[model samples]
Target chain A: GQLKQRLAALDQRIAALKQRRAALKWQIQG
Target chain B: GQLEQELAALDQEIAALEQERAALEWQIQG
Candidate 1:
């Protein structure tokens, strides 16, 4: 489950960090 | 697949590790 990555809080920062990580990962192979 | 040329022993280890990891993930999500 995504819960494997424990988040201290559920907020924009958590969502943004996830989005950024996924974006950069895609760019790496794009 | 030069990047993935694991030794025979490593291949076996990888399979076992993957199984353990997958089982853990399943339990976490189950």
Candidate 2:
């Protein structure tokens, strides 16, 4: 199950930002 | 904050209950 609508929006944003950070980290490492 | 609303609600409810508690406390003390 997922978060509620309002909460999901927050979580989605955080997840996207974190994913971007992780991708940048991976690129730097590789 | 609309995002701040949930915690605010809880805080209000806790405060109301505490008011009830203080009244009870005063009754018991007096």
Candidate 3:
């Protein structure tokens, strides 16, 4: 369960990173 | 479309690496 929870948190972080990456890209270019 | 293409390319890389990592994890556990 701890591994599962860790993986879930990692997934959330990845999603957040993706959003921020796109946001910055958009702000810089568009 | 070029920007979207890059975004999709990044996602594809992420998915591909994730798939390989999952396989590696299974190999480690099993």
Candidate 4:
């Protein structure tokens, strides 16, 4: 139960970071 | 040239992590 909750938060955090990594990559390409 | 390498790495990392996220989603389901 608790594991799911923690994992959920980690999922959200990772999503935020994941998109950011792409954005930075795009910026660097130029 | 160096920045292009970094961008390539970021693209690789994002794809790898997307796989991880999918795995974690299954873990969360249970």
Which prediction has the highest TM-score against the true structure?
3
lDDT of 1 by residue, A1-30 (tens): 354543222333445555655555555556
- Give, for candidate 4 chain B, the lowest lDDT window spanning 10 residues: B10-19
lDDT of each: 0.49, 0.52, 0.66, 0.71
lDDT of candidate 2 over B1-30, digit per residue (tens): 443454455456545645655565555555
Number of the top-ranking candidate, with lDDT as the measure: 4
The C-alpha TM-scores of every prediction are 0.39, 0.45, 0.52, 0.51
Q: Please provide, for model 1 over B1-30, each residue's C-alpha lDDT reduced to its tens digit, 9 standing for 90 to 100.
A: 332333333455545645555665666766
**Candidate 1 lDDT (Cα, whole model)?**
0.49
Per-prediction DockQ comes to 0.07, 0.03, 0.12, 0.28
Q: Native contacts recovered by candidate 1, as a share?
A: 0.00
Question: How close is candidate 3 at the interface, in terms of C-alpha RMSD after superposing the true interface residues?
Answer: 4.9
lDDT of 3: 0.66
**Cα lDDT tens digits for candidate 4, A1-30:** 765676677677667767877777777766
For candidate 1, give the docking quality class from DockQ.
incorrect
Per-prediction share of native contacts kept = 0.00, 0.00, 0.00, 0.25
Higher-scoring candidate on DockQ, 2 or 3: 3
lDDT of 3 by residue, A1-30 (tens): 655665666577667758866875785588
Candidate 2 per-residue lDDT, tens place, A1-30, comes to 232343445455555555655555555556
lDDT of 3 by residue, B1-30 (tens): 676777777677668657655765665576
Off by over 4 Å in 4: B1-30
